[PDB]
Amino acid sequence: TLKDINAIPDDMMDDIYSYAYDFYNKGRIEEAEVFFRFLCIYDFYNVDYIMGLAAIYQIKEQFQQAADLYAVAFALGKNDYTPVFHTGQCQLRLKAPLKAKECFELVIQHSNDEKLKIKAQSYLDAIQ
Amino acid sequence: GSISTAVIDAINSGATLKDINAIPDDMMDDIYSYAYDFYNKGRIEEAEVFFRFLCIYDFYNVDYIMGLAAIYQIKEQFQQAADLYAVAFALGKNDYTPVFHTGQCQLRLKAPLKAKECFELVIQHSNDEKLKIKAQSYLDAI
Ligand SMILES: [Cl-]
Ligand SMILES: [Cl-]
Ligand SMILES: [Mg+2]
Ligand SMILES: [Mg+2]
Fold first, then answer.
1. Contacts of B11 in chain A (CB under 8 A)
2. Distance (Å, rounded) from C-alpha B132 to C-alpha B126?
3. InterPro entries recorded for this chain (chain B)?
4. Are B7 and A109 a contacting pair at CB < 8 A?
C-alpha cells in the first residue's frame, strides 16, 4: 500500500488527519468523508483513521456501515473499547437493543477507561 | 488480506456480492464444509483459499474468521492470526476462546503484557472452566 512505501511524509499525514477532524468538527461532513476515506486508502491498518471514517458513517446515520468499521477498529486496537461503545450506540439506532446491551456491558467489564465506562453505564441504565 | 478487503469495501461503500445475496446461505454452508474437509486433510493452502473466499463474501461471520485465524496461527503468521481472533471476539462477545488464542499470539509477538491482559480476561469473564485452566498455565509462565 501507499503507507507500506512511505509515499507521503509522516508529518503531512498528521496534517491531513487533523484537517479531516477540522472538517468534521465544523460540520463539513462531505469534505471530512473525502479526507477520512483518503486516510483509510493510504493506511487501512491505522485504527484512528478507521475510527474517523466510522464516525462519519455514524453521523450520516449509516449505522451498520459504522458498526462494521468499529468492529475492525476494535480488533486492530485490541484493548480500546471506544469502538465497542460506539457500536452499542449504532445497534440502538438499528433497533437491536440486546446487541447494544452486550456492547455496553463489554465496555463495563473490560475497559480500563473510567470516563468511557461512565458513558456506557448511562446507556445501560436507560435500556429497557 | 481479509481485513484489507473489509476496509476497502467499507470505504467504497458500493454494492457487495452479499448486498445482492449473490450466494445463498445453503451454498455458503457447503463451501464452509469443503474448507474444513481440506483443512482436516492437511490441505491447508486450499482451505486458506476457501476461507479467504468465504471472508470476502461474508467477512462479519465468526465461523469464517475463526477458521482463517486458526490457519494463520498454525502457519506462525501470528499478527494476522491475532488480528482475526480479535475480530472474532468482536463478532461473538461471549466466547473467550478467541481471546485466549489472541493471548497465545501476542506472546509469540513478544508482547507479554498484551498477552497477560488476554489471559486475565479469560480468567475473570469466561465460564469455560477448561479454557480458564489453559489461560492460567500461560499466566504462570509469564
Ligand atoms: Cl437485539
Ligand atoms: Cl489484511
Ligand atoms: Mg456496504
Ligand atoms: Mg467466573
1. 37, 40-41, 53
2. 7
3. T3SS_Ca_resp_chp_LcrH/SycD, T3SS_Ca_resp_chp_LcrH/SycD_sub, TPR-3, TPR-like_helical_dom_sf
4. no
Residue A67, Cβ neighbours under 10 Å: how many? 26
Closest CA to B109 of B134, B80, B133: B80
User: Under an 8 A CB cutoff, do B10 and A65 touch?
Assistant: yes
CA separation for the pair B57, A44 (Å, rounded): 19
Rounded to the nearest angstrom, the minimum Cα separation between A113 and chain B is 15
- Distance, CA of A47 to CA of B28 (rounded, Å): 30
For B100, the grid coordinates are: 485466549
What is the residue whose three cell numbers read 437491536? A96
Q: Which three cell numbers mark B42?
A: 492437511
Q: How was this structure determined?
A: X-ray
Handedness of CA A90, B114, B122, B33 (dihedral sign): positive
B61 Cβ neighbours under 8 A, 6+ residues apart: B54, B55, B91
- Across the interface, do B93 and A109 touch by the CB < 8 Å criterion? no
- What count of residues does chain A have? 128
Closest CA to B7 of A76, A13, A78: A76
| Whether the Cβ atoms of residue B125 and residue A90 lie closer than 8 Å to each other | no
Per-residue DSSP letter, B11 = H
B83 in Cβ contact with B1 (< 8 Å): no
Amino acid at A67: A
- What count of other Cβ atoms lies within 10 Å of the Cβ of residue B101? 22
A65 alpha carbon to ligand 3 midpoint, in Å? Answer: 6
CA distance A58 to B117: 30
